[PDB]
Amino acid sequence: VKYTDAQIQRLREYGNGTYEQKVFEDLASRDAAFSKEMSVASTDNEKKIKGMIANPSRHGLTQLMNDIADALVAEGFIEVRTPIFISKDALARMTITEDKPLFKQVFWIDEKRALRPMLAPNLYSVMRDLRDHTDGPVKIFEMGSCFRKELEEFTMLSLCDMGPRGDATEVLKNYISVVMKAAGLPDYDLVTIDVEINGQEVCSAAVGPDVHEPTSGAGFGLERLLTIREKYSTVKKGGASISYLNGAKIN
Amino acid sequence: GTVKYTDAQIQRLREYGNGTYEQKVFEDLASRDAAFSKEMSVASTDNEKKIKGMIANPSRHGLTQLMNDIADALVAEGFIEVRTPIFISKDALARMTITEDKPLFKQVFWIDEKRALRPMLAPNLYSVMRDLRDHTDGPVKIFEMGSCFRKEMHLEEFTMLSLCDMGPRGDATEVLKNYISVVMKAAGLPDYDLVQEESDVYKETIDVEINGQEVCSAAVGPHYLDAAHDVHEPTSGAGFGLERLLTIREKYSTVKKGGASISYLNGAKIN
Ligand SMILES: Nc1ncnc2c1ncn2[C@@H]1O[C@H](COP(=O)(O)OP(=O)(O)OP(=O)(O)O)[C@@H](O)[C@H]1O
């Protein structure tokens, strides 16, 4: 006997335990355990919010962004910031056309512009222009909000490099290692390449997608990383919200 | 003399250059045009040097660094850093008194019939601060840094830093002035003026100006706005334009160079 779907939802509202795994042998014992775990979840949540107010910290998502960013700069990556608005033409050069399914997920701002659903269009542009100014490899990254109709707003970390690279795949796997280790998630699986933790995809990366330079890139979902690391019971608690703050429900 | 660079020449000089071209005066058109030619070459050269320096010495972004400098200073003062959604509701805008008839309403980017890109951080911050009051009897002090959007030193996407305090100990105006000092000093801009300005949302604000350029609007209340958000105690708050601060501190010739861009990187044009 397990918690009902409704009970799971109620437990996850204020609690960050792993309630789906629990089994009982009696509706009566399920119900008694549920009552106790709901009370513990709620009191634990209240104590946690009372603690943040009393000892404020950098936001958990901001802290994670800083930890990863300082690691990438030490690896030689330039941090860039690009606009949230992108053009329809930019999406089309990404092959996101009325045909592709991602297109139907795009938030349009007007007839010619959209909220970016990924960071790559802008980063490709910046990377290519930076290469106009140097003979060497160019390595950049951005962290920022992306938007898709479904989290509808999520924070992507995208890194990319252009230029000569001995063993592109090995180099890309090392970039992934730098990020994951800096994020506090050193244990993960690789599946052009996907990063999974217990089957949950947290990164998609690839080597080398009219003359072009060698290029590779990796995109991480930072709320997903934070959720896994802090063992929050939903992906809606660690990022931007007016209901949650650093894992705790404020209302 | 009395001859200046033309408006078009000023725009051309500022594309790659961060000098103060609007101050130049010349005897005649020939001397103006000769100086323009020389200064355009200097600007392009200096710009290329800056780009090559950034490539040789990769760094955090200047806007990110400013955001961290100020945020660390506020957390040290006991402010909670929050992050709230970019999307907000039409009702939330109405609660700020941003309704159909108001000028700012015409500046709003709508996502659908009920939701918009936030033009300001106050709507979400009011909600969060009010809910945090449910959990403490003491001061509630929060801030957010994040993109806001307006149809328009103006950008259509800009980064606001908004702070607010519900129930501070002491006079709300002196407390607000001290918080402004913390931010401005942490931003590397200790010299500024505080100027009363009119506001259709707040009635009157205290603005932070540097050489006449607004970089922040701040206010206590007003009471009708607090009551509209179920807040029944003294509140204050301040909203800073981070690109404006960075532009002034780094002496960039336009506000488009230090923030998010596909043409500029930390003051230098890459294309
Ligand atoms: N379009 C914009 N681009 C860049 N910064 C902006 C923009 N609008 C506002 N800001 C910054 O946000 C701060 C707080 O926003 P506020 O609502 O007071 O702006 P505002 O009074 O409309 O400004 P302005 O008179 O300069 O248009 C402003 O002091 C300014 O520093």
Ligand SMILES: Nc1ncnc2c1ncn2[C@@H]1O[C@H](COP(=O)(O)O)[C@@H](O)[C@H]1O
């Ligand atoms: N709707 C979403 N919510 C949260 N994270 C997302 C979302 N879409 C994509 N991501 C993250 O972004 C990464 C790259 O996305 P994609 O470009 O779709 O492969 C994924 O591996 C996820 O971690």
Ligand SMILES: [NH3+][C@@H](Cc1ccc2[nH]c3ccccc3c(=O)c2c1)C(=O)O
């Ligand atoms: N005038 C700008 C500046 C502004 C001024 C007063 C404020 N007071 C507040 C009170 C509670 C919650 C948040 C705020 C806050 O954002 C805030 C911001 C704007 O709002 O765009």
Ligand SMILES: [Mg+2]
């Ligand atoms: Mg304005």
Ligand SMILES: [Mg+2]
């Ligand atoms: Mg103004």
Ligand SMILES: [Mg+2]
């Ligand atoms: Mg103002």
